[PDB]
Design a binder for this molecule. Structure first.
Ligand SMILES: Nc1ncnc2c1ncn2[C@@H]1O[C@H](COP(=O)(O)OP(=O)(O)OP(=O)(O)O)[C@@H](O)[C@H]1O
Ligand SMILES: Nc1ncnc2c1ncn2[C@@H]1O[C@H](COP(=O)(O)OP(=O)(O)OP(=O)(O)O)[C@@H](O)[C@H]1O
Ligand SMILES: Nc1ncnc2c1ncn2[C@@H]1O[C@H](COP(=O)(O)OP(=O)(O)O)[C@@H](O)[C@H]1O
Ligand SMILES: [Mg+2]
Ligand SMILES: [Mg+2]
Ligand SMILES: [Mg+2]
Lengths: 234, 308, 70, 312
């Protein structure tokens, strides 16, 4: 069975009690607004034991910014555990997987090769793609004036991501960067057509999050803080 | 990329020519193609195509690493490098971290070069580890380095030995910088087991000095070059596991009156750590964290250039 | 000063005029990357072209002895 | 692996190569220019240039020794030399800011005269390039300063009698001094950009030049309807170009700036390696070392005499 978005995070998905059968969500906003901290929060809620209030499901992290910090995640796990110890932290990290990608072509090849990974790990239900827009400018410049050439590899990546999400009832969280003057979309239409829930992050510590749900067009506002233990919703 | 003889075992000129005649030229086309349709054409064994796809995929594809293993390796391969300044070490929680990108931002004369030289001297003498200093604006001076060293020891021979552990490179444009960084990457690739030398800290003084003149007009070549430089720095930091310090300017917007880095929105995402230096005299600067993954931002304390 | 008189080829001059670049002042005020995009040449080629254009704009060297010598 | 975007290729050729599947330079190493010209739709010359482009230091102790043997340029002002660390250094950029009349041009002419002092007397024995943007350069004043310097060297030479000083003073002459100063007059921003572009070629055949002076970073008429030319110039036109010129040819670049007059762009403050502000206080001239990577900030006195720049 698969958990629901309400179970994963009951503060952002209070009205999403339906079990996930392939869901795609985007986190958008400027630098230092807590997108990666939110990813840590969800990762902790998934990989932590059921004894400590977690789901105990595996997570796959694809890092294209190279910004993943193992020490920060470890300290968050230590603070969220009632009885923190090295062995329990090691067990929690045993459900976490990390991949580094250096280019869009490299990312596409990795996505093609992850089919076996998903087949061999039935508990892997969360897929995080941090900065899907990491290679935007380089691909755009290498594509020339033809928009079809600029977006070719990202379009193929989007099709592969859709196939992966549908084939295995996964939840995909993709982080995008505010690189051009609220919300100015720039990624290929193949990616845009897939997004069901979008979230916008803002700074005031004090942080705010605006959730737009395209399934019903509902709009919501939330507030949270970040401390030594990670995210805590107000 | 392009299919070539010797790219992977099992590739022959005739097979490559048939595939190219059938509009299959790159590894991406091969892996993402319907191998049944290709196999029935060209008179090529389907199993041969399957093996070729598997080999190419296993060769050019990244693979996942379990979190526990990464924790184990980083527990021993990560180091904190004292900057030689007590207050700045207090701000940074014991100082620079290897494996990430640290940016120092400030105005003209704020103390960026002074901090870089203090760290270079402390690494060359206190740690006796090789440093690479990439000077793009003439900031580095050998007499200042020796002056900083003499405040640490009165042994002339030790001062000379420390001065021999610092490599200085001049790169006045983006292409020279990229060439120097790729040369360093290749050198580290050769000296896989090198320990006596094997520079461990890379200082890049005024990344802005080279990046800024690439931005202008409606062309996006400058953005791509800046992002390529960011990729080079990120691979030097994370892949090779060395500390990378980069100096960048500060700017203030006409409407957004706060202080911020100078290379635009895309660059703002690049550094893992950012230290802002401000002035209220010769010394008496204030330092605060403008960006971090391990601490709250906004805490400020004082540093004195004159003393250190 | 028009770019045809500097010594540039007719094809390149037309390719530049398609971007409203017609004089030495217009050419020089552009940066190397912009010129690379406009003309299709490489970096070293753009620098050779800049040197060619500036040889038609730069002043003449003099010596202080010659200045005193009237 | 080196991505093709990292090389100074032409954008069109790079796009053609990427469309043909080439991503890194290592894939273009073996292909022949003729084969490449047909694999992708480019001419033979472009293929040859592409292959050439694809195919194409000292520790701190060596630099310490180099800056020790290589001298400084004195200005005959003891306090200014002391705060500067010996004199105007080589392989660096020095900006002299201040309001008009402080004496920025007099120091430039004094350094032009002083870069020719023979090595046996502690000089560098070099020649000067003077790029004048304002037209303030005067030759008779240079004659006065050269005569004063020759008198000073003659006065010192008496102590050593017939040593190398005698032979050195023979070459050091007014006419030989004036024949080693190369003067350029840039009337506008276009000419300044052109001459800055052409300087390396001039220096490659004048290897005895050790000092380059740009008297005027922004033109004096101001009210710049040509603001675009100023923007393009100060954009790397005199930050990277002059630092590279100073380092490759081992000389000293001195820039004069009228805009900054008190203790021209937010990025232009980071350009010059050293910044000296000349300002009046109590109706007397003072020099402040506003920025420097090797000397702490300090203020000293100076004055101008018929013999040139001198202490108070
Ligand atoms: N231990 C801590 N205690 C309190 N606040 C913290 C702590 N660690 C981090 N923070 C705060 O949490 C913020 C996390 O934001 P973060 O940098 O992860 O955002 P982001 O959206 O992922 O950014 P980017 O796009 O630049 O990668 C940090 O900027 C800092 O403000
Ligand atoms: N030997 C010294 N002793 C004490 N203080 C010094 C010494 N040398 C320089 N300083 C101080 O350090 C300042 C120089 O700072 P620094 O070179 O780090 O500037 P910066 O912010 O990096 O500049 P830029 O961005 O233009 O390169 C000098 O103005 C002076 O205040
Ligand atoms: N023969 C001389 N004797 C003494 N002082 C002089 C002589 N000639 C010029 N001066 C002084 O030197 C100053 C030179 O200023 P100048 O070099 O033009 O400054 P800036 O370069 O900042 O405009 C003048 O203000 C003048 O008073
Ligand atoms: Mg983040
Ligand atoms: Mg500096
Ligand atoms: Mg003057």
């Amino acid at each position: 069975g698969r958990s629901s978005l309400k179970e994963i995070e009951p503060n952002l998905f209070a009205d999403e009690d339906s079990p996930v059968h392939g869901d795609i969500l985007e986190f958008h906003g400027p630098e230092g607004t807590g997108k990666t901290e939110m990813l840590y929060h969800l990762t902790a809620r998934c990989i932590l034991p059921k004894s400590e209030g977690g789901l105990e499901v595996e997570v796959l992290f694809i890092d294209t910014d190279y910004h993943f910090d193992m020490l920060r995640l470890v300290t968050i796990l230590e603070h969220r555990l009632s009885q923190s110890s090295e062995e329990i932290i090691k067990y929690c990290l045993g459900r976490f997987f990390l991949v580094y990608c250096s280019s869009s072509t490299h990312l596409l090849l990795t996505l093609y090769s992850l089919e076996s990974m998903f087949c061999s790990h039935p508990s892997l239900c969360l897929l995080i793609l941090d900065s899907l827009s990491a290679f935007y400018w380089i691909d755009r410049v290498n594509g020339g004036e033809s928009v079809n050439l600029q977006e070719s590899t990202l379009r193929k990546c989007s099709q592969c991501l859709e196939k992966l999400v549908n084939d295995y009832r996964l939840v995909l969280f993709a982080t995008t960067q505010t690189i051009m003057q609220d919300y100015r979309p720039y990624l290929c239409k193949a990616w845009q057509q897939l997004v069901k829930h979008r979230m916008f992050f803002s700074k005031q510590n004090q942080f705010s999050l605006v959730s737009r749900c395209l399934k019903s067009n509902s709009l919501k506002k939330h507030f949270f803080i970040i401390g030594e233990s990670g995210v805590e919703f107000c | 990329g392009v299919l070539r003889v010797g790219l992977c075992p099992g590739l022959t000129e005739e097979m490559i020519q048939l595939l190219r005649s059938h509009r299959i030229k790159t590894v991406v086309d091969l892996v993402s193609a319907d191998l049944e349709e290709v196999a029935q054409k060209c008179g090529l064994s389907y199993k041969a195509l399957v093996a070729l796809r598997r080999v190419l995929l296993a060769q050019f594809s990244a693979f996942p690493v379990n979190g526990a293993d990464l924790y184990e390796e980083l527990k021993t391969s990560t180091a904190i490098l004292s900057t030689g300044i007590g207050s700045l070490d207090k701000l940074l929680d014991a100082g620079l971290y290897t494996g990430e990108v640290t940016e120092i931002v400030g105005g003209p004369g704020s103390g960026k070069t002074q901090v870089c030289l203090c760290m270079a001297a402390n690494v060359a003498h206190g740690l006796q580890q090789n440093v690479l200093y990439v000077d793009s604006n003439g900031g580095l001076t050998a007499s200042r380095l020796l002056q900083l060293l003499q405040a640490k020891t009165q042994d002339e021979e030790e001062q000379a030995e420390a001065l021999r552990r610092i490599q200085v490179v001049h790169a006045f444009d983006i292409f020279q910088m990229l060439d120097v960084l790729q040369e360093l990457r290749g050198t580290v690739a050769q000296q896989v087991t090198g320990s006596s030398g094997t520079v461990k800290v890379v200082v890049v003084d005024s990344v802005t000095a080279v990046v800024s003149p690439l931005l202008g007009g409606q062309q996006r070549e400058g953005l791509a070059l800046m992002m390529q430089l960011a990729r080079e720095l990120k691979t030097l930091a994370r892949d090779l596991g060395m500390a990378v310090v980069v100096t960048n300017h500060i700017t203030r917007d006409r409407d957004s009156g706060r202080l911020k880095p100078a290379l635009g929105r895309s660059w703002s995402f690049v550094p893992s750590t950012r230290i802002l230096l401000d002035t209220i005299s010769g010394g008496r600067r204030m330092a605060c964290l403008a960006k971090s993954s391990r601490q709250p931002t906004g805490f400020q304390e004082m540093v004195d250039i004159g003393t250190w | 000063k028009k770019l045809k008189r500097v010594g540039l080829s007719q094809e390149l001059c037309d390719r530049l005029s398609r971007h409203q670049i017609l004089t030495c002042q217009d050419f020089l005020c552009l940066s190397p990357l912009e010129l690379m995009k406009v003309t299709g040449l490489s970096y070293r080629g753009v620098h050779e072209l800049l040197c060619m254009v500036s040889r038609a704009c730069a002043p003449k060297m003099q010596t202080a002895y010659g200045i005193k010598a009237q | 692996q080196r991505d093709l975007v990292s090389f100074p290729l032409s954008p069109a050729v790079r796009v053609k190569l990427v469309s043909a599947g080439f991503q890194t330079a290592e894939e273009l190493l073996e292909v022949k220019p003729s084969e490449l010209s047909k694999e992708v739709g480019i001419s033979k010359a472009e293929a040859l240039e592409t292959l050439q482009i694809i195919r194409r230091k000292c520790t701190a102790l060596e630099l310490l020794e180099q800056e020790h043997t290589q001298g400084f340029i004195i200005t005959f002002c003891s306090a200014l030399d002391d705060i500067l660390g010996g004199g105007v250094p080589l392989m660096k950029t020095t900006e002299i800011c201040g309001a008009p009349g402080v004496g920025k041009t007099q120091l430039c002419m004094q350094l032009a005269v002083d870069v020719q002092i023979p090595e046996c007397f502690g000089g560098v024995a070099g020649e000067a390039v003077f790029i004048d943007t304002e037209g303030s350069f005067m030759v008779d004043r240079v004659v006065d300063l050269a005569t004063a310097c020759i008198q000073h060297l003659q006065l010192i030479a008496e102590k050593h009698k017939g040593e190398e000083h005698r032979k050195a003073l023979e070459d050091f002459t007014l006419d030989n001094i004036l024949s080693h100063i190369y003067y350029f007059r840039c009337r506008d921003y276009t000419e300044l950009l052109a001459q800055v572009y052409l300087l390396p070629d001039f220096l490659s055949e004048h290897s005895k030049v050790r000092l380059v002076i740009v008297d005027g970073i922004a033109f004096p008429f101001r009210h710049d309807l040509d603001d675009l030319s100023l923007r393009t110039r100060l954009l790397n036109g005199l930050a990277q170009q002059m630092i590279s010129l100073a380092n490759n040819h081992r000389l000293a670049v001195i820039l004069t700036n009228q805009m900054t007059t008190k203790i021209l762009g937010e990025s232009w403050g980071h350009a010059a390696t050293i910044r000296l502000i000349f300002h009046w206080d109590r109706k007397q001239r003072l020099a402040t070392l506003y920025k420097s990577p090797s000397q702490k900030e300090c203020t000293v006195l100076f004055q101008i005499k018929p013999q040139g720049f001198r202490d108070t």
